[PDB]
Amino acid sequence: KVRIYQLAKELGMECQELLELLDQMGVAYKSHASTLEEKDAEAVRELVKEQRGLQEKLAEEERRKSLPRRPPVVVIMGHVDHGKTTLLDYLRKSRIAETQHVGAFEVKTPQGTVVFIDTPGAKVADIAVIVIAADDGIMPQTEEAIAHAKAAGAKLIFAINKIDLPQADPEKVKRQLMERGFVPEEYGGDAIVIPISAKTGQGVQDLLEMILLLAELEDYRADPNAEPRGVILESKLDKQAGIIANMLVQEGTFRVGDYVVAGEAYGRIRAMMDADGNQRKEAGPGSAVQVLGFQELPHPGDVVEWVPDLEAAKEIAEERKEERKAREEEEKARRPRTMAELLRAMQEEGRKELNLILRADTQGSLEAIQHILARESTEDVKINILLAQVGAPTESDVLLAQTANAAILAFGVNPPGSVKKKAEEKGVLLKTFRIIYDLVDEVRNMVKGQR
Numbered sequence: 126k127v128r129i130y131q132l133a134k135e136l137g138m139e140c141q142e143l144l145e146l147l148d149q150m151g152v153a154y155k156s157h158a159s160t161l162e163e164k165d166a167e168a169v170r171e172l173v174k175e176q177r178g179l180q181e182k183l184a185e186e187e188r189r190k191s192l193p194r195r196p197p198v199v200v201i202m203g204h205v206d207h208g209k210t211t212l213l214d215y216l217r218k219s220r221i222a223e224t225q226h227v228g229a230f231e232v233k234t235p236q237g238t239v240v241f242i243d244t245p246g247a248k249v250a251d252i253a254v255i256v257i258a259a260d261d262g263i264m265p266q267t268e269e270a271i272a273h274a275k276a277a278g279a280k281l282i283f284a285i286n287k288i289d290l291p292q293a294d295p296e297k298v299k300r301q302l303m304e305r306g307f308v309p310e311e312y313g314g315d316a317i318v319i320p321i322s323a324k325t326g327q328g329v330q331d332l333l334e335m336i337l338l339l340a341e342l343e344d345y346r347a348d349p350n351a352e353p354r355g356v357i358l359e360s361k362l363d364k365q366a367g368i369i370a371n372m373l374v375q376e377g378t379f380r381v382g383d384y385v386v387a388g389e390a391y392g393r394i395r396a397m398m399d400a401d402g403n404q405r406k407e408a409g410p411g412s413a414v415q416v417l418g419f420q421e422l423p424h425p426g427d428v429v430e431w432v433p434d435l436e437a438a439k440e441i442a443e444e445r446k447e448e449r450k451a452r453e454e455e456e457k458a459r460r461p462r463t464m465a466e467l468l469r470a471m472q473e474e475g476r477k478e479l480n481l482i483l484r485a486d487t488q489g490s491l492e493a494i495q496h497i498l499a500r501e502s503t504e505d506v507k508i509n510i511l512l513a514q515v516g517a518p519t520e521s522d523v524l525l526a527q528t529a530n531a532a533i534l535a536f537g538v539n540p541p542g543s544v545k546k547k548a549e550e551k552g553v554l555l556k557t558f559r560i561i562y563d564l565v566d567e568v569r570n571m572v573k574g575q576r
């Protein structure tokens with residue numbers, strides 16, 4: 126027994142909504158007063174609740190999208206002397222006066238502020254700026270950077286340096302990328318090519334505007350409250366201080382007095398210093414800070430977690446550890462057995478036939494999946510890249526695998542309607558990956574012969 130209006134008062138509904146529901150549920154009412162059976166009592170109560178939760182799912186989409194934007198982190202890669210140390214020096218400069226490092230530094234532009242790494246892994250950089258000297262083109266250190274970088278999922282700009290000089294061939298470079306598959310935006314393609322100098326700092330400016338654009342185009346936004354998290358930039362034994370650990374802040378705000386955990390290493394932030402020279406008791410996301418008070422040396426690209434108490438710190442840091450020691454003995458034996466199978470396991474033939482195919486967003490990035498893969502048939506098995514091409518997949522390919530038994534792997538395109546469909550019904554190892562690595566680590570599974 127209930128009065129439609131009592132129900133909407135109880136639930137926290139008001140009736141306009143309550144009758145509206147019932148007048149989709151399909152249950153008679155003369156007016157808001159008219160009575161209901163409890164079966165009714167809850168027929169809404171249950172059919173009211175699902176929506177009510179369901180809306181609080183959008184709210185979180187409410188917490189999610191409206192979140193403040195956060196400083197873009199650029200890191201820089203390139204060949205030993207193609208202008209990296211030099212262009213960084215240019216970027217640090219501004220507070221002329223306006224210094225021990227924290228692993229990163231800032232440039233504050235009217236358009237935005239950008240973090241640029243100052244280091245010698247967690248995914249620490251939304252972006253990479255391949256430095257290619259205009260003169261000596263693409264030399265091995267340069268390919269390695271792009272490949273590795275493109276596994277990061279890091280967004281890449283190619284910066285050309287040493288152009289003030291009278292012998293740079295900027296085409297030579299643009300071409301060199303082309304043949305590779307990173308084809309300039311200028312040609313009609315998808316790579317970003319910015320002619321720069323590092324001594325008069327021509328191009329620096331834009332490389333500033335460009336990156337910001339890239340930051341506008343993907344709202345890189347971080348919510349200060351969220352459980353605080355970061356990653357480990359650097360770690361040292363400070364001669365006077367003790368254990369000192371450069372961190373960059375990912376989401377969350379870290380406050381001195383916070384308990385923290387970073388792989389096997391734990392502590393209580395006792396202090397935090399920001400590159401300026403001033404102590405902070407808050408670190409917001411995109412904040413490179415020098416943290417003091419840790420009980421070990423942490424390793425770089427370990428995620429910094431916040432913990433409420435220093436006992437949870439110990440538990441996680443030792444939950445992590447006794448798996449690693451657990452590994453170790455594992456090789457502490459594997460290695461005693463196959464380490465010496467043939468010495469260099471050579472007389473041993475080599476033949477294992479691992480076959481796969483690669484379809485991609487771009488060649489600019491298909492020829493990075495391999496570069497990485499190619500270092501990596503270091504096990505008894507040697508893995509075959511059967512056909513490589515760009516794009517979404519083939520049923521034949523689903524058929525191809527059979528002749529093949531090669532597994533089909535993809536990055537930057539998702540499968541199609543029945544290719545997943547024949548893909549699956551068909552006995553074929555199909556994959557879709559977010560990031561090229563998470564394409565790659567998987568490849569490691571495939572050493573164990575897929576059984």
Ligand SMILES: Nc1nc2c(ncn2[C@@H]2O[C@H](COP(=O)(O)OP(=O)(O)O)[C@@H](O)[C@H]2O)c(=O)[nH]1
Pocket residue numbers: 203204205206207208209210211212286287288289290322323324325326
């Ligand atoms: N001509 C010219 N040379 C440059 C410029 N910027 C840097 N270089 C040169 O690049 C070389 C390598 O710089 P360095 O920072 O030591 O190496 P990297 O950081 O590994 O690229 C230096 O010997 C400089 O002469 C530039 O704008 N023009």
